[PDB]
Design an enzyme around this catalytic site. Structure first.
Site, PDB file in Angstrom:
ATOM      1  N   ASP A 177      28.094  28.349  24.615  1.00  0.00           N
ATOM      2  CA  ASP A 177      28.442  27.787  25.581  1.00  0.00           C
ATOM      3  C   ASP A 177      29.999  27.194  25.771  1.00  0.00           C
ATOM      4  OD1 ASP A 177      25.656  25.970  27.103  1.00  0.00           O
ATOM      5  OD2 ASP A 177      25.737  27.803  25.967  1.00  0.00           O
ATOM      6  N   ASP A 184     -15.058   4.803   1.350  1.00  0.00           N
ATOM      7  CA  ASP A 184     -16.488   4.336   0.605  1.00  0.00           C
ATOM      8  C   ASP A 184     -17.056   3.347   1.221  1.00  0.00           C
ATOM      9  OD1 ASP A 184     -14.172   1.796  -0.613  1.00  0.00           O
ATOM     10  OD2 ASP A 184     -16.299   1.328  -0.500  1.00  0.00           O
ATOM     11  N   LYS A 234      14.289  21.368  21.564  1.00  0.00           N
ATOM     12  CA  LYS A 234      15.482  22.231  22.215  1.00  0.00           C
ATOM     13  C   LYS A 234      16.480  21.955  21.005  1.00  0.00           C
ATOM     14  CE  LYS A 234      18.032  24.931  24.438  1.00  0.00           C
ATOM     15  NZ  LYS A 234      17.788  26.337  24.418  1.00  0.00           N
ATOM     16  N   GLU A 244      27.789  21.185  32.012  1.00  0.00           N
ATOM     17  CA  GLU A 244      28.283  22.073  30.764  1.00  0.00           C
ATOM     18  C   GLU A 244      29.891  21.810  30.885  1.00  0.00           C
ATOM     19  OE1 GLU A 244      29.955  25.354  32.751  1.00  0.00           O
ATOM     20  OE2 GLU A 244      29.932  25.011  30.599  1.00  0.00           O
ATOM     21  N   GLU A 292      26.907  24.139  21.952  1.00  0.00           N
ATOM     22  CA  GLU A 292      25.983  24.450  22.956  1.00  0.00           C
ATOM     23  C   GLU A 292      25.300  23.191  23.461  1.00  0.00           C
ATOM     24  OE1 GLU A 292      25.326  28.431  22.379  1.00  0.00           O
ATOM     25  OE2 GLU A 292      27.098  27.374  22.797  1.00  0.00           O
TER      26      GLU A 292
HETATM   27 MN   LIG Z   1     -15.216   1.374  -2.842  1.00  0.00          MN
END
Ligand SMILES: [Mn+2]
Ligand SMILES: [Zn+2]
Ligand SMILES: [Zn+2]
Ligand SMILES: [Zn+2]
Ligand SMILES: [Zn+2]
Lengths: 1603, 49
Positions: free
Chosen positions: A88, A1160, A114, A50, A101
């Site tokens: 942070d 179909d 996250k 960090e 952050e």
């Molecule tokens: Mn059809």
């Protein structure tokens, strides 16, 4: 302590750059204890990460871990009681704040989860920090690896290994240890036995309401007895009473119903197409006004284009005075033209470009002369030196390239302009906003005025498309009921004859819908033609198609030549129908024509649904649909009606009427309105769930339901599985009966159906969701703003020019580059860009540091102008202001006075609303437990460790709602998160494998599709009962619980083990799917909150604040999202349909076979031992299908004359071609980025079109249309260009290379040079086949160029210097010589030879057409052609010398001689070299018959037949993969290493000489790498895709014989 | 074997049909097409007598 002690030594190679680094290392190294060691090490690694991420952004690391309230309270800032959040990294300056952050996540799922959980938590703070405080910009720095810039990128993984080993050695819970190790590895499907599956005392009722009646072991005889008894009950209880669902045809009543529904009788509209529709009336006016009845113009056009070019540089930082200066230049040029040559203001102006007291100006504007001189009279006396600074600013700090020798610096003499104004007096337009008929009776006009109507439609449509092209950042000089006296309206022009032109006047810009006024000008007498109102971006199809439509209508009419007297009545009607369809595009016409298709389908057959004629009616509005419906129904009745002699040739009639109904493809499918379509989609989505009674409201989004939510969920689940087998009341509501399902499963298990459980190949081997369609989401916008602000802050180490705005163009998609990058944006994209610029500018201004808004939305950026009049804002912004504004424009714009500069720059211009908003902004009118304190640094807490029956500890399978554009009606669309996408992928692959083991389903298996086609063809040819069943509401009705039950009852026996696979993971994923959460669009929420009756709007208002809050997430039982469980749905449908076929075979002793495609199906029934005794069977089948969740749609048909499957109609003897579908597909989808790709696209489309016997006279017209589309954009004609004209039926046995060769051969008349080149190519081919067999040496000759390669080949075969000077003379111009044309096209926001790109595509794995073409034409006119720098195309083409040495005139502007290009010789290449390459490659591809000489040869237009290609390959036909890669690595090592195979792991086979040294692939792969339009290697690795060509016998007799 | 015992021009007449060497023609459509010309216009062969 082996590694424990080694840790303290290995971490010693750390640099304590910061004080906290050392302060923590002295505490870590001096403390040896296993319980505080792991936490200290993890926190030190996290702190290093960090701290690097913070120092990367000029940040200040948070060493106190204090909240934002106290960090604001350190300075003087009041706390408005913000939420408690620990940042942070923070950076506060002036009155602005930067919170960042950072984190680290190694897998993409947790990274996304996250990011989308930290960005929202940061954005939720600005609404409370802005109301009574300062502004903030959020930064989120995510890293997918532990790398940094402090260590050598090699110790970090070693420390990770030591830590995980120490952790797995000794510990000190159960899942806190499974996550830490999983969050320290590098990279790692089903078999998720690592999970726990803990119960929650709710799944008990789930299993008790889902699996109580499911047994799946019923015997075989009992099923037979129950089915027999059920049939016996059905026959005498629900069928003999008249409660069926199907009925016989009775054609006469069908025609009566058609006349009742289509041909309106209670309407007041007359029987004239031109009176009702306005555009047809304007077209009629212009046509019958045109049919029955010089260096000045060029100089004017040139200087006007020069002014239009200088306007694009925006070198005046203002808009008003720029237009005043350009108007001054233009009027001075007019007064300098009118000094002499008295026959200019009346000869080359009235007949040229001028209208009544109106002159043409920059930006396609038309300005009144009197207003022009009145405005030029201003700015003088109060600013006397206005003409001085403007005259001395176009020399210094200016391009200094201008022909304005005297037209610029001249003082405008007003007396001469007044004389001109008094010459021609006012006849201004009227701009008509908001009974006798004399219209020549279209049916009895000549054959020349109708073509003229089509041509006029083409011209006006092109003018509309061009009207869509006017610049966006354009404001008129002065602003503006039922009639408006136009003085400053925009205008477009189109030519019609020698003297008369046509003007199209409008007042607005953009892509919206407008009102246009069409006028004419014969010899200066400006007449009136009319006014109308339309959307410009729906008229692209007729832009150049005035010969394609005529030809297709002509041959469609000639289809009916069996009766001389039938076509004479249907010709004009069909042409007028096409014209009326084109002049009025709307979704209702599409829907009506589709209904007509289904009506014809039901008319031809014998049995049809009882609810058909209620699916054909469309409520017509605007009185323009009535005439088209009358025309269509009249055509249908004229062709179909009759007593006895009405079916003399019924195949032709069916073909004609089917192609007439398929005219709905001419109208575009582009969502006339976005908000309306989203609202309608939400209606259609949420209506059935509210009707059923199971739609819950906003859940916890974490896998926790309250008591009432589970109550309603279980009630819905019970209602789903509670249908009986006798009650006939529930035959239209969702749900399935358990007895029939048990019968189905019990019969499937005991190998009785046509499918079985004997499968092989064991199957177990950052966008926001609530806004789908927005060009810029909130996340992307905030990220861009934060990036720009952080960059500008880091630069200030104040003052800033407008270059900051340039930054917003660099990351979203030097005045020249700014103009190239700004012009590529669309209208709403320009609006979003303005919003971003405003936000960044206010943020920078804060960094440098009416009452109805506080109670309402306090954001002044969305202050609407529709809540206030115009005069009040216009007068209030010009009040007294002392310290708000400042004197001057202050181009340098120092920091601290940016708001005053913006206010002044907005007030000096014409628009005042921005000034008012800036005044509002400026006036301050907006005011040691290791489970809780360890999951904050880098611990991936949200990773899947234990799951329940409704979630996975990592979400609840969120989805997103959107729509998809179709012809008839739009479809649904679901876009989900990444985790849910992975889960759907798992289940879909499993079900696809299981179905691949099956046989009859044809959804992802083309061989079964071809088998179905053959079965259907043989059935229609033999006379078997074909039943085409399309099912209604397949998506929004199915439910995952049905699949759960089906899988719980199945066994899926292994192939050779017989183990009865346990489907636990699949059922777990299905249970997760059953509880999915769908987020509603935010536009619908806004529209229903802001505020005709609507069920979904009623539900929204009932759930807005009555029960809970405004609905944002809806969970329900039955969704089965469209396009999510496609394969499982197909599997279920296949099983159930095989069961239904078994039942039919058992009861009615017939032989059925059925093919399914998940929505179909087609059922082919062979009956024993006319077709009136099969109604009971069809009704019983429909009843049983309704007993499952498979409701049948009224569009389904049963018959013995025509069959349909996947839009492919099979009839007795042949197949209907569907001409108009393919033609309308070719005229659409003009997606162009380069002319080559456009040519190739239209080539493929025309090939697949001519495959279905369309014609050879309509493909040449599409070719000419594409050529003219390329020519109009300013690119000019090229030898290759688009597809060829004057082609022949030899699209068979011919590839793109062959027709390119034919085009080049057609350029030359006596084919002498081409014959010589072809003979040399034959010599080279015979010498490379045998004899003097060559090698890769020729490769070293190909990569050089064109001239040297051709002369080398020629001296290889044999030649002299005479051939050198002769063949190399024919030259053509190639603008893409030093690369490719640079151009920024209309793409979406946020962003080397082509063979490499094709191979990369092979190895790995909402926009308009008119707007795209406008952007293409706009980008092909700027500095595009590259050299060395960039330049124009007209600049290159103006350097050619008009030598005319009788060798450069055989094809003008295409082929030149060598000395005609001495000025520009960088762009000059021989065409005989390309011809040689094409001949040799075609010899490689499709035989050696391409060397002979073409000879010409020495039928009712309806004799069709099928033919096969006659190609013979000489390139080892198989030609698989792993062969081009080996040759590329051999010939081009550096090009094989870079740009190719980074994503490849099987180099071993491609390196061990896997069939190396192919016969001809060695040389025929280097010719493909240098030619940018040859493209054969991307063609050899592809199938024919046609394999058969239907063509008429009239074309096959006029072909060319080349053998 | 021939087709499915249908005229092939109207689809709807199945009674004492006549063959055209490839299909089954109707009793009236044959006369109409014979009065028109000598060709068949549905199978492109010489019509029967
Ligand atoms: Mn059809
Ligand atoms: Zn009329
Ligand atoms: Zn020449
Ligand atoms: Zn007949
Ligand atoms: Zn015949």
């Amino acid at each position: 302590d082996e590694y424990v002690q080694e840790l303290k030594g290995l971490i010693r190679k750390h640099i304590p750059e910061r004080c906290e680094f050392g302060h923590q290392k002295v505490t870590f190294l001096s403390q040896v204890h296993p319980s505080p060691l792991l936490t200290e090490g993890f926190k030190l690694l996290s702190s290093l990460v960090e701290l690097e991420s913070c120092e990367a952004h000029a940040c200040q690391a948070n060493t106190d871990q204090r909240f934002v309230d106290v960090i604001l309270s350190d300075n003087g800032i009041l706390c408005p009681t913000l939420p408690k959040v620990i940042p942070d990294g923070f950076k506060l300056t002036g009155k602005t704040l930067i919170l960042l952050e950072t984190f680290v996540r190694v897998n993409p799922d947790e990274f996304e989860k996250k990011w989308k959980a930290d960005m929202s938590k940061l954005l939720n703070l600005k609404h409370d920090l802005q109301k009574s405080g300062v502004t903030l910009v959020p930064i989120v720095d995510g890293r997918s690896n532990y790398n940094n810039r402090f260590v050598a990128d090699w110790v970090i993984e070693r420390i990770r290994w030591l830590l995980i080993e120490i952790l797995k050695a000794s510990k000190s819970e159960d899942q806190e240890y499974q996550r830490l190790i999983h969050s320290l590895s590098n990279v790692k499907l089903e078999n998720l036995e690592h999970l726990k599956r803990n119960s929650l005392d709710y799944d008990e009722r789930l299993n008790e309401s889902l699996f109580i009646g499911l047994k799946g072991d019923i015997r075989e005889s009992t099923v037979r007895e129950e089915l027999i008894k059920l049939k016996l009950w059905f026959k005498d209880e629900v069928f003999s009473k008249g409660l069926g669902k199907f009925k016989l045809t009775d054609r006469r009543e069908l025609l009566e119903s058609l006349s009742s529904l289509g041909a309106h009788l209670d309407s007041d509209v007359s029987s004239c197409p031109f009176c009702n529709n306005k555009l047809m009336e304007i077209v009629y006016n212009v046509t019958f006004s045109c049919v029955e009845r010089s260096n000045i113009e060029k100089h004017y056009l040139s200087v006007l284009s020069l002014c239009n070019k200088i306007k694009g540089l925006k070198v005046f930082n203002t808009r008003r005075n720029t237009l005043l200066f350009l108007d001054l230049i233009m009027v001075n040029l007019m007064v300098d033209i009118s000094d002499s040559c008295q026959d200019a203001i009346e000869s080359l102006r009235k007949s040229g470009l001028i209208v009544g007291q109106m002159v043409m100006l920059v930006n396609d504007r038309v300005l009144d002369i009197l207003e022009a001189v009145k405005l030029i009279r201003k700015k003088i006396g109060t600013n006397p030196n206005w003409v001085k600074n403007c005259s001395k600013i176009l020399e210094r700090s200016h391009p200094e390239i201008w022909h304005h020798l005297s037209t610029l610096i001249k003082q405008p003499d007003f007396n001469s302009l007044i004389s001109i104004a008094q010459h021609l007096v006012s006849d201004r337009p009227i701009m008509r906003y908001s009974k006798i008929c004399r219209h020549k009776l279209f049916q009895e006009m000549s054959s020349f005025e109708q073509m003229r109507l089509f041509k006029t439609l083409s011209s006006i449509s092109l003018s509309l498309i061009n009207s869509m092209k006017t610049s966006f950042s354009s404001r008129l000089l002065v602003n503006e009921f039922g009639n408006v006296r136009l003085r400053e309206c925009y205008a477009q022009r189109f030519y019609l004859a020698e003297s008369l032109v046509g003007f199209l006047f409008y007042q607005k810009t953009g892509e919206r819908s407008r009102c246009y006024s069409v006028y004419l000008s014969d010899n200066g007498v400006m007449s009136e033609q009319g006014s109308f109102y339309c959307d410009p971006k729906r008229f692209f199809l007729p832009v150049f198609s005035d010969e394609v439509l005529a030809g297709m209508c002509e041959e469609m009419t000639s289809w009916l030549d069996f009766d001389t007297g039938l076509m004479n009545d249907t010709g004009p009607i069909l042409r007028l129908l096409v014209l009326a369809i084109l002049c009025s595009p709307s979704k209702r016409n599409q829907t009506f024509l589709q209904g007509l298709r289904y009506f014809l389908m039901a008319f031809a057959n014998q049995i049809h649904h009882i609810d058909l004629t209620s699916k054909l009616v469309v409520e017509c509005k605007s009185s323009s649909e009535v005439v088209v419906q009358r025309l269509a129904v009249g055509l249908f009745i004229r062709l179909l009606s009759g007593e006895s002699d009405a079916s003399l040739f019924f195949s032709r009639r069916f073909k004609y009427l089917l192609n007439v109904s398929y005219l709905c493809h001419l109208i575009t499918k582009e969502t006339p309105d976005r908000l309306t379509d989203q609202i309608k989609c939400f209606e259609k989505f949420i209506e059935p769930k509210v009707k059923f009674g199971c739609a819950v409201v906003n859940p916890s989004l974490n896998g926790k339901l309250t008591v009432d939510q589970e109550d309603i969920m279980i009630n819905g689940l019970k209602k789903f599985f509670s249908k009986s087998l006798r009650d006939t009341e529930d035959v239209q509501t969702p749900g399935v009966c358990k007895e029939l399902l048990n019968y189905c499963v019990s019969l499937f298990n005991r190998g009785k159906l046509k499918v079985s459980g004997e499968l092989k190949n064991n199957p177990f081997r950052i966008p926001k969701l609530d806004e789908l369609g927005n060009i810029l989401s909130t996340y992307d916008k905030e990220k861009l703003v934060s990036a720009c602000v952080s960059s500008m802050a880091e630069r200030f180490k104040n003052l800033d020019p407008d270059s900051t705005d340039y930054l917003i163009l660099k990351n979203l998609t030097t005045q020249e580059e700014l103009s190239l990058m700004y012009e590529a944006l669309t209208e709403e994209q320009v609006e979003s860009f303005n919003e971003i610029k405003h936000d960044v500018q206010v943020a920078l201004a804060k960094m440098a540091d009416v009452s109805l808004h506080e109670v309402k939305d306090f954001d002044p950026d969305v202050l609407p102008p529709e809540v206030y009049k115009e005069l009040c804002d216009a007068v209030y912004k010009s009040s007294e202001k002392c310290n708000f504004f400042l004197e001057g424009v202050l181009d340098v714009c120092p920091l601290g006075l940016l708001l005053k500069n913006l206010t002044t720059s907005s007030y000096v211009d014409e628009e005042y609303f921005m000034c008012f908003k800036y005044l509002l902004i400026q006036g301050h009118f907006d005011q040691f437990t290791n489970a809780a304190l360890r999951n904050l640094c880098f611990y991936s807490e949200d990773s899947p460790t234990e799951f329940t029956s409704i979630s996975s500890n990592s979400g609840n399978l969120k989805f997103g709602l959107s729509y998809k554009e179709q012809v008839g009606s739009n479809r649904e669309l679901y876009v989900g998160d990444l985790n849910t996408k992975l889960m759907t992928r798992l289940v879909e692959d499993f079900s696809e494998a299981v179905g691949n083991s099956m046989k009859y389903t044809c959804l992802n298996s083309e061989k079964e599709f071809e088998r179905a086609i053959c079965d259907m063809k043989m059935a229609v040819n033999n006379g078997d009962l074909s039943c085409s069943y399309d099912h209604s509401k397949w998506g929004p009705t199915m439910s995952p619980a049905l699949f759960l039950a089906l899988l719980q009852m199945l066994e899926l026996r292994t192939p050779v083990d017989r183990s009865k696979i346990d489907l636990d993971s699949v059922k777990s994923i299905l249970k997760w799917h059953l509880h999915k959460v769908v987020e509603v669009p935010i536009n619908v929420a806004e529209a229903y909150c802001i505020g005709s009756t609507s069920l979904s709007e009623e539900f929204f208002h009932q759930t807005m604040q009555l029960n809970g809050q405004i609905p944002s997430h809806i969970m329900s039982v039955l969704d089965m999202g469209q396009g999510i469980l496609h394969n499982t749905s197909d599997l279920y449908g296949l099983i159930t349909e095989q069961f239904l076929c078994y039942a039919l075979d058992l009861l009615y002793d017939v032989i059925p076979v059925s093919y399914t495609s998940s929505d179909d199906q087609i059922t082919l029934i062979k009956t024993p031992s006319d077709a009136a005794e099969w109604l009971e069977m069809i009704c019983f089948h429909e009843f049983l299908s309704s007993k499952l969740n498979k409701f049948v749609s009224p569009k389904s048909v049963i018959g013995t004359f025509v069959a349909e499957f996947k839009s492919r109609f099979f009839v007795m003897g042949e197949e209907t071609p569907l001409l108009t579908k393919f033609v309308a597909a070719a005229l659409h989808n003009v997606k162009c980025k380069t002319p080559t790709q456009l040519s190739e696209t239209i080539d493929t489309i025309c090939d697949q079109c001519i495959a279905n016997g369309v014609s050879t006279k309509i493909v040449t017209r599409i070719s000419k249309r594409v050529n003219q589309l390329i020519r109009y954009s300013g690119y000019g004609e090229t030898p290759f260009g688009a597809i060829e004209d004057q082609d022949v039926k030899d699209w068979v046995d011919g590839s793109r290379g062959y027709r390119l060769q034919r085009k080049i051969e057609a350029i030359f008349h006596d084919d002498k040079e081409t014959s010589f080149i072809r003979n040399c190519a034959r010599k080279v081919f015979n010498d490379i086949k045998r004899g003097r067999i060559f090698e890769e040496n020729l490769i070293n000759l190909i990569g050089r160029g064109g001239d040297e390669a051709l002369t080398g080949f020629l001296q290889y075969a044999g030649c002299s210097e005479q051939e050198v000077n002769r063949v190399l003379n024919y030259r053509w111009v190639n603008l893409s010589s030093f690369g490719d044309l640079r151009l920024v096209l209309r793409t979406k926001l946020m962003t080397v030879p082509t063979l490499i790109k094709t191979l990369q595509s092979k190895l790995s794995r909402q926009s308009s057409v008119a707007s795209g073409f406008i952007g293409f034409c706009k980008s092909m006119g700027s500095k595009c052609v590259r050299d060395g720098g960039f330049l124009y195309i007209k600049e290159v083409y103006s350097g050619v010398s008009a030598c005319t040495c009788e060798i450069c005139a055989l094809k003008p502007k295409i082929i030149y001689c060598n000395n005609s290009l001495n000025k520009v010789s960088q762009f000059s290449k021989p065409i005989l070299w390309d011809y040689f390459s094409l001949v040799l490659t075609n010899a490689c591809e499709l035989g050696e018959w391409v060397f002979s000489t073409v000879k010409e040869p020495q039928n009712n237009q309806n004799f069709f037949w099928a033919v096969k290609p006659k190609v013979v390959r000489q390139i080892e036909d198989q030609l698989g993969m792993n062969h081009v890669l080996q040759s590329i690595r051999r010939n081009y090592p550096v090009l094989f290493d870079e740009h190719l195979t980074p994503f490849m792991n099987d180099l071993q086979v491609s390196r061990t000489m896997d069939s190396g040294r192919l016969k001809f692939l060695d040389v025929c792969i280097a010719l493909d790498m240098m030619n940018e339009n040859l493209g054969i290697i991307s063609h050899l690795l592809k199938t024919r895709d046609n394999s058969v060509y239907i063509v008429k016998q009239s074309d096959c007799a006029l072909a060319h014989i080349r053998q | 074997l021939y087709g499915r015992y249908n005229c092939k021009c109207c689809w709807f007449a199945d009674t004492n049909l006549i063959t055209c060497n490839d299909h089954y023609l109707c009793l009236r459509c044959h006369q109409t097409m014979l009065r028109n010309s000598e060709l068949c216009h549905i199978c492109w062969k010489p019509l029967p007598t």
